[PDB]
Write a protein that binds this ligand. Sequence first.
Ligand SMILES: NC(=O)c1ccc[n+]([C@@H]2O[C@H](COP(=O)([O-])OP(=O)(O)OC[C@H]3O[C@@H](n4cnc5c(N)ncnc54)[C@H](O)[C@@H]3O)[C@@H](O)[C@H]2O)c1
Ligand SMILES: NC(=O)c1ccc[n+]([C@H]2O[C@@H](COP(=O)([O-])OP(=O)(O)OC[C@H]3O[C@@H](n4cnc5c(N)ncnc54)[C@H](O)[C@@H]3O)[C@H](O)[C@@H]2O)c1
Ligand SMILES: Nc1ncnc2c1ncn2[C@@H]1O[C@H](CSCC[C@H](N)C(=O)O)[C@@H](O)[C@H]1O
Ligand SMILES: Nc1ncnc2c1ncn2[C@@H]1O[C@H](CSCC[C@H](N)C(=O)O)[C@@H](O)[C@H]1O
Lengths: 454, 443
Amino acid sequence: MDHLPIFCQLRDRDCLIVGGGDVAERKARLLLEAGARLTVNALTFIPQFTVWANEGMLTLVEGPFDETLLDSCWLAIAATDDDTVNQRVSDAAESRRIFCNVVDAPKAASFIMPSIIDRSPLMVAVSSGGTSPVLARLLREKLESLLPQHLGQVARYAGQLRARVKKQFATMGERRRFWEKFFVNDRLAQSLANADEKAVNATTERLFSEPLDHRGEVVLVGAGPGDAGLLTLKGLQQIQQADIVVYDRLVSDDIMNLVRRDADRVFVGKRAGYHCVPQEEINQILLREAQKGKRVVRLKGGDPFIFGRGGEELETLCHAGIPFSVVPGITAASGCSAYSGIPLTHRDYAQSVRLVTGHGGELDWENLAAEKQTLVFYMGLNQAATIQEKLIAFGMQADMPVALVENGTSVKQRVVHGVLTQLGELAQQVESPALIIVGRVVALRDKLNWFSNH
Amino acid sequence: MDHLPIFCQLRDRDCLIVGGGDVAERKARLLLEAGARLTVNALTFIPQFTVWANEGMLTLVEGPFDETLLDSCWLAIAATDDDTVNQRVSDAAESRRIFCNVVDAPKAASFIMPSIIDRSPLMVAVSSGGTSPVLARLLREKLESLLPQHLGQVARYAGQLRARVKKQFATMGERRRFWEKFFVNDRLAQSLANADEKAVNATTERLFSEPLDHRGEVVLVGAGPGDAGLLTLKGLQQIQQADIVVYDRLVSDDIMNLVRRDADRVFVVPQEEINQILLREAQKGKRVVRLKGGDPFIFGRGGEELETLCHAGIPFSVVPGITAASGCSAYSGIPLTHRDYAQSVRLVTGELDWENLAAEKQTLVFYMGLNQAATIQEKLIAFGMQADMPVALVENGTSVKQRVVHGVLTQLGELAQQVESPALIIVGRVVALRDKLNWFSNH
Ligand SMILES: NC(=O)c1ccc[n+]([C@@H]2O[C@H](COP(=O)([O-])OP(=O)(O)OC[C@H]3O[C@@H](n4cnc5c(N)ncnc54)[C@H](O)[C@@H]3O)[C@@H](O)[C@H]2O)c1
Ligand SMILES: NC(=O)c1ccc[n+]([C@H]2O[C@@H](COP(=O)([O-])OP(=O)(O)OC[C@H]3O[C@@H](n4cnc5c(N)ncnc54)[C@H](O)[C@@H]3O)[C@H](O)[C@@H]2O)c1
Ligand SMILES: Nc1ncnc2c1ncn2[C@@H]1O[C@H](CSCC[C@H](N)C(=O)O)[C@@H](O)[C@H]1O
Ligand SMILES: Nc1ncnc2c1ncn2[C@@H]1O[C@H](CSCC[C@H](N)C(=O)O)[C@@H](O)[C@H]1O
């Protein structure tokens, strides 16, 4: 151990920062967030320092380094770009035993300022010990995605339950399992952040009212079009806490490897081409397994409420009193749009975007063939030619640009394009899953293409 | 934050622990491993202290607490079994501006000792401030597993190559790329672990003898509607390692907090002026991130902000985000599509083509139309849309301050005054599903 990490209480405690540029400002933002009684000493200050000074957040001392400024300080930071002046601040700080950070050089002075993950009162800090700040950022990034946003809410709330926990749970092992369940309860954390007193109570009691080993709930999660990177942070957090993951084929492999490892997996997808699971049964197992006290995650391709009906898999939960929630995901329209260089909206081209089903009651042609609009078809490859003919017939121009995006956002993403009179033809050049994009925005791809094609 | 974490260098710096029992011992163990010049003042002492005493790893002062033993110290730790002596210690520490910790009283004194996960020189610290000690112990376990054992080796080697890296690569980004390649090489990592200097040098030499790109870039990143957890993993990575971030007001502050604390930031300033800020900064060789609300290629001006970059020879890429239409609807318990309800969805702007928009077997979503709302219902109703059709206006979707108002067309213009921007307007049948599917707020 080359450094001893410690967590300092800075509320209304004197601290000094020497410097007034951009580096000093970050140091001040941080110190202020911690509530320090801050004095900033520099030759010149950037605007944000004037803004704070003018709303009582800190004190400014314009001029060179005044050593007496350290006489009652608990922390000092050298943040000027003059190595000799920083040296004097450090020396003046060390002579009076004041922890000081020289910020240009990390191991020259008293303490290192680590990369922080703030979930107050819960906090994590990572340090390179001065070797690699790059590594520190890599860790902060990974740690931020793993700690839910409102984790601090439950850390703070735990206090108002400690007594009740010791009273119903008399064995240390039991009380620990309680906290393990309590600390991953994201719905409660959200309710507290929303100041939803009834749900906070409703969710607090279900925590004491249900069997200890039960964590019944259903979470609909949008996996995104394929790229594991397009999963949302909450979606990852939910996926790492699942007891059972119910998924279909449009959920990527990379996405599934992020699942927790012997968290049971239930493939409700269309097997070998011919065996798909009827919806009521998928609905029933989600309700059934949550009733058994399992944290159920329904992993859907793209987004849950856009042509992959989580609506159906949910209106049966809000009647068994099975708490539930929804984590939207990047829909194929958005993923493919961004990865093919085809904006769904651009300056003149259009400002009405339409997400339409492909192939009960069929297709409204001149609502479609009309324009100043961008058309995006989901599930329409076996109806591509039948879309071509029924679009030019109702007025759409034959030279209207079109494109097909297969396996959007994935390492095998294929993009093909041309003009409308080539649609059905370009479609027999692609396989499912793919989207069709009809619109003038398709020409923007010559200026915006950035992703590799296959 | 209620605490500020710092990593202190304790080598040759005096420290004081008052107390000499089991609690005092573990604390002394850390101070010693951190290399502090330690002094332990205690009425009685357990065996290990004596052991440390004759190897010369510390000094022992037998007897009651002496306030002057703090006069040369940088840190004071109170670990007696006497609540009264511990505060005499913290009052003596405080009067001398010496950070102090009282072990069984975390709400007191000036600093709390966090749980540590050691991978020297790499180190991670976790704490609750005493609010949820079980939470911090649970996190420590998980982190002990998540963090490879030999991570310190890679980190130690990274520091050693620092000097050569700078004197081989001229810019800021060939070195950023050097590191990205460095920390991704599993051969180099495995090689350090089995001290194979042949494999470490071989791989290292090829890293240095590589042609790395110096140019910067622009990366359009969707921040989503507001909720920070709706940002994508890649979106987080991009804002976590950017040089400068250009953001608008539709980027919630919780998301702005996820940005590199080391990056510069420009609030936004005409599209054309904004357009220039991007390529200019990329020109300098910087990694620019244009953080936009919702999704960049849907009613943002993402296309415009990129269409000249190719002409300029500036690398770019796009990271999609949850559009406001997807986030608000889902968070308001209104799915954009259901059973046979509507299988066609429209995202619109705030003349327009009302007959194509009042028609149905479709769902409508209006961005930017809170004050053109009266003309939408007057026009929609006129062009054929049934006035018992439910509508909804979502204010600050996905956020902790979200509000939802519902009703019917004939009230549209009215409800539009119950809310303010940023708000979204959902027209369609699926809005009736709100209370059969509502899950975020009772608001
Ligand atoms: N160590 C570094 O200087 C360093 C480290 C990393 C990044 N940077 C980069 O440099 C850019 C800004 O540097 P910056 O943060 O220093 O901002 P800056 O260059 O604008 O300001 C530096 C501060 O040092 C002060 N200063 C200089 N001589 C002084 C003296 N004799 N007495 C008192 N004050 C003195 C000025 O008052 C000024 O407020 C940053 O945006 C960051 O990218 C700097
Ligand atoms: N060997 C022992 O002293 C011993 C053995 C068994 C139980 N206990 C009792 O010790 C108490 C535990 O205290 P703890 O939680 O800190 O555990 P602990 O094991 O850390 O022991 C407390 C320490 O405080 C030191 N000390 C106490 N008051 C002091 C003072 N005013 N000035 C200087 N030094 C002082 C003693 O050297 C002792 O080592 C409990 O009452 C427990 O019943 C003590
Ligand atoms: N990676 C991908 N690339 C292109 N299209 C995709 C895709 N993933 C899904 N799709 C489209 O989505 C259709 C299935 S319907 C499910 C869509 C999903 N709920 C979403 O929000 O994206 C497929 O037929 C295909 O047209
Ligand atoms: N949190 C939020 N709640 C409701 N509407 C929002 C919102 N954030 C953005 N919007 C909508 O987006 C409009 C600005 S245009 C930007 C839209 C963004 N590119 C997206 O894809 O969602 C606002 O006027 C509002 O209508």
